Amino acid sequence: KSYINDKGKEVLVLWGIHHPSTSADQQSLYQNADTYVFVGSSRYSKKFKPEIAIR
Amino acid sequence: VSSFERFEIFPKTSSWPNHDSNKGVTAACPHAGAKSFYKNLIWLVKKGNSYPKLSKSYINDKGKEVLVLWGIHHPSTSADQQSLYQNADTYVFVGSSRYSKKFKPEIAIRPKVRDQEGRMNYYWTLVEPGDKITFEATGNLVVPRYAFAMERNAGSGIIISDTPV
Numbered sequence: 001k002s003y004i005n006d007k008g009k010e011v012l013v014l015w016g017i018h019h020p021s022t023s024a025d026q027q028s029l030y031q032n033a034d035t036y037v038f039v040g041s042s043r044y045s046k047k048f049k050p051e052i053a054i055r
Numbered sequence: 056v057s058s059f060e061r062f063e064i065f066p067k068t069s070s071w072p073n074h075d076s077n078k079g080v081t082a083a084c085p086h087a088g089a090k091s092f093y094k095n096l097i098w099l100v101k102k103g104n105s106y107p108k109l110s111k112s113y114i115n116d117k118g119k120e121v122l123v124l125w126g127i128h129h130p131s132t133s134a135d136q137q138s139l140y141q142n143a144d145t146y147v148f149v150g151s152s153r154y155s156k157k158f159k160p161e162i163a164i165r166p167k168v169r170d171q172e173g174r175m176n177y178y179w180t181l182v183e184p185g186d187k188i189t190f191e192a193t194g195n196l197v198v199p200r201y202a203f204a205m206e207r208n209a210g211s212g213i214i215i216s217d218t219p220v
Contacts, residue, residue, distance in 0.1 A: 038161070038163040040163060040164070040165040040166060041165075041166055042166055042168055045129070045161075045165055045174045046161075047161035047163055
């Protein structure tokens with residue numbers, strides 16, 4: 001899903017990445033043992049990877 | 056910089072017999088309309104339909120610190136990854152006496168910037184005299200072509216103005 005800045009001002013966008021404690025938790029919430037997250041814009045480019053471990 | 060000399064660290068015509076050193080052009084860096092690329096860098100692609108594991112080393116033999124620049128390309132789609140390097144999974148490692156880092160391409164589509172949806176991350180390091188720099192990759196590597204031997208002068212800055220010289 002994409003959004004285009006249409007308000008004429010700089011837009012502050014906040015998002016979070018969740019790191020599950022166990023592999024069962026990973027499958028319990030997202031159903032995929034392996035997942036990837038990518039956020040991209042005209043200047044920002046980074047791909048995230050969940051780190052599944054108990055803290 | 057006290058002294059600045061340009062020597063061909065990795066010659067284009069003889070350093071990459073297993074990889075294509077002439078298809079590395081794109082529409083984002085044009086020259087006289089035709090697609091071109093950075094003159095000091097070579098965008099190595101698969102030579103036909105094969106990209107064997109690449110390894111080539113240079114030893115600083117000029118007596119001065121050598122500035123080496125290289126880039127890492129992140130394809131937009133998996134088809135693009137197989138179209139240029141023939142390997143869905145590739146790794147890039149650069150190692151010297153002090154530098155040690157392994158890169159991993161991040162394949163994802165980005166918003167178009169100069170008609171490009173892929174990203175190219177550039178890197179640099181300094182090689183002291185009597186040191187060797189080693190390049191290792193199975194793909195997604197932009198090999199250097201020209202290197203600079205230099206001696207930094209302590210201090211000085213950069214002036215940003217339209218005043219003539």
